């Protein structure tokens, strides 16, 4: 086993869950108990990236959709997308920079910093049924802080 994965569910700090909304796009919203099965189950692959004093390099793939979250430019602006892949090739161990995030996880509160674009983070909006994106601000209008639950 060249890298270890674990299968987790994600929520933001305002308790919104991530569901997949029509493909190539995750949206965050609040869910009722009878639709908890609609949560995007993630696979957190603990890849290799830059040694940091206190961050942990991880790649975020969806589970048997063969999609991985990715960070690229788009009109010269860092943007978050789902790249499709061949599962015989991934989960690699040295993943390309657009796949790797730096996990900051403090008292089980996670935020993932893009390794490609430093000081950019997986953000959700305070609003409902609104797609996950990538932000340039912590502590402001957007939520950058997440909770993890296991499978």
């Amino acid at each position: 086993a060249p890298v270890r994965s674990l299968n987790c569910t994600l929520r933001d700090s305002q308790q919104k869950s991530l569901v997949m909304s029509g493909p190539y796009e995750l949206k965050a919203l609040h869910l009722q108990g009878q639709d908890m099965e609609q949560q995007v189950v993630f696979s957190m692959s603990f890849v290799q990236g830059e040694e940091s004093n206190d961050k942990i390099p991880v790649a975020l793939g969806l589970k048997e959709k063969n999609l991985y979250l990715s960070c690229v430019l788009k009109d010269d602006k860092p943007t978050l997308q789902l790249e499709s892949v061949d599962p015989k090739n991934y989960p690699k161990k040295k993943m390309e920079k657009r796949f790797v995030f730096n996990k900051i996880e403090i008292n089980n509160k996670l935020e993932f910093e893009s390794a490609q674009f430093p000081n950019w983070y997986i953000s959700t909006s305070q609003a409902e049924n609104m797609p996950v994106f990538l932000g340039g601000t912590k502590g402001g209008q957007d939520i950058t802080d997440f909770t993890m639950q296991f499978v």
Partner: protein, 287 residues
């Protein structure tokens, strides 16, 4: 022959240009046990002078400037507003024919960016992580106007006005933090603006907020060529110590490490290793 208490540095008195600043004579109730009213009744007079910066000549303060700009009112010194060249140290002195006590305070006027940058050493208000609602208050605001006038207080994070934040609510003079997270780290600015006699003034304070270790995780010290490694959970006013004994006291190398939540990690090298925090003193032996 005076009691020269010296220079009171328990100001935080750097101040932005074009803003008001009142300074209370530090003598009263600090250096001296009494207030202004008492001392006046005791036949003391209060006098003021200064030395300009890059100067040794003690000059008088000029109270006859345009628009009564630098003013005096009892134990308070008023700049309305400060100018750059006001920077220096101000002395208030109380004297009798038989009495003399004086002290001085530093006044450093400073310039501002459009987004609140300056050589100002910002003060640090640490916030407990995940700790219900915590509030910061816009500092040094009392005295500048009466309750009769209601000002505008605008709060900023960075260059940005705080509007519709996730866990941050501006409540007038108070900025509220809901369950702080490390995402909440940064510089926060308050701009309080008020009317005075048909002019409008502005008061600007900026401070660094740092989210640190909860009291509910604060704990006595945890122990791990001989390394004595100790982990000190963050506690607010705590003297973290570490020492080897042999029975009483070869080289050594201390090494403080800190974390995002300011939890300390003192590693120290080389038979018993000790550690003392405000919550404990422990010791562990070596093989």
């Amino acid at each position: 022959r005076c009691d020269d208490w010296g220079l009171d540095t328990m100001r935080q008195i750097q101040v932005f240009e074009d803003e008001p600043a009142r300074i209370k004579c530090p003598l009263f109730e600090h250096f001296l046990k009494f207030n202004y009213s008492t001392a006046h009744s005791a036949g003391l007079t209060l006098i003021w002078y200064w030395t300009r910066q890059d100067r040794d000549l003690e000059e008088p303060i000029n109270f006859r400037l345009p628009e009564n700009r630098i003013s005096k009112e009892k134990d308070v010194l008023w700049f309305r507003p400060t100018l750059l060249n006001d920077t220096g140290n101000y002395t208030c002195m109380l004297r009798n024919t038989t009495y003399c006590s004086k002290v001085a305070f530093p006044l450093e006027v400073v310039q501002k960016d459009s987004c609140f940058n300056s050589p100002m050493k910002l003060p640090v208000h640490k916030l407990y992580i995940e700790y219900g609602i915590q509030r910061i208050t816009c500092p040094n605001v009392d005295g500048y106007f009466p309750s009769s006038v209601k000002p505008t207080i605008t709060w900023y994070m960075g260059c940005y006005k705080i509007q519709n934040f996730n866990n941050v609510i501006p409540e007038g003079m108070n900025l509220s933090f809901l369950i702080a997270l490390i995402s909440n780290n940064g510089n926060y600015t308050c701009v309080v603006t008020y009317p005075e006699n048909g002019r409008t003034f502005h008061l600007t304070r900026t401070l660094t907020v740092k989210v640190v270790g909860s009291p509910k995780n604060a704990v006595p010290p945890v122990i791990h060529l001989i390394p004595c490694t100790v982990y000190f959970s963050f506690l607010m006013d705590s003297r973290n110590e570490v020492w080897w004994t042999i029975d009483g006291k070869v080289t050594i190398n201390e090494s403080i490490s800190h974390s995002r939540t300011e939890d300390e990690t003192r590693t120290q090298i080389l038979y018993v290793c000790h550690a003392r925090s405000a919550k404990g003193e422990v010791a562990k032996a070596a093989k």
